[PDB]
Design a protein around this nucleic acid. Structure first.
Lengths: 140, 141
DNA sequence: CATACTTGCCTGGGCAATATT
DNA sequence: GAATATTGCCCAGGCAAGTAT
């Protein structure tokens, strides 16, 4: 008797889907020497253009110290630069460098929609949309 | 300005945040027993198998073998799991639950019950949940 | 005092060598 | 040769204590 599937039938399922997505995404991003997490953060910064670590934390749903070390790694890889914040002397601003935008465009052009297709190759557009709706309805 | 990430994987942030919520909830439910969600999961698998090799356990958990080795080390140091020489393989190891491991496992089972499945699926109907699972399994390899 | 990092310690997973058999 | 651990080096997140403004 599987105690875990008795308590949370969804649990293993959600976990495994998330894992599949992570593995696939990493495989696709692999030839450009960037990870899925790093790429995700780069995309968020790219959305905001300019953003503070706390708001970035809000967007990614992640711990602030974790994001700090992430930003350290991103800076050392020359994808991200830290700027002073004209509105606050204790905070900083985070923005993409030229290389950041570069590798974002490289990721976009390389991966395209191949990943989205492979991940949902067993589903139809209606099934994908329904899955999306249900999933977001799970969100509090 | 537009989301490149969301453009490439429309379900990415969504599955991630759902899974994260699930994990945070399960961790908060298991708080007083001083056992994490992952640890409890491995304890469950070992419990079902009764006896199991780390390779088979790796396949049933879908986790790296080395990571699993370290997890098993943690579970041993907390006196929940024991390793023993595998009588059917000279190079293998069998893993099993200690009495305390099975005890805290049962403690968890009785503690959380269906509260987690309930709180996670409260915004859904019965067959909304059923459909959700169906689709989720069909996605899986 | 309140906020924004910042760092340290911990669990945890992925990948890459090792023995061991 | 092939499969089974085990270990080391990474990246990565949660948590808490400390720092800066």
């Amino acid at each position: 008797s599987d105690l875990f599937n008795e308590i949370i039938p969804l649990g293993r399922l959600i976990h495994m889907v998330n894992q599949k997505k992570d593995r696939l995404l990493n495989e696709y991003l692999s030839p450009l020497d960037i990870t899925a997490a790093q790429f995700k953060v780069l995309c968020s910064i790219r959305c905001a253009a300019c953003i503070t670590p706390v708001e970035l934390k809000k967007v990614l749903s992640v711990d602030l110290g974790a994001l700090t070390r992430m930003l350290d790694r991103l800076v050392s890889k020359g994808w991200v630069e830290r700027l002073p914040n004209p509105n606050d002397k204790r905070g900083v601003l985070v923005k993409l460098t030229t290389g950041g935008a570069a590798i974002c465009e490289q990721c976009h052009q390389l991966v395209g929609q191949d990943l989205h297709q492979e991940l949902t190759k067993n589903l139809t557009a209606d099934e994908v949309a329904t899955l999306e709706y249900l999933l977001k309805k799970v969100l509090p």
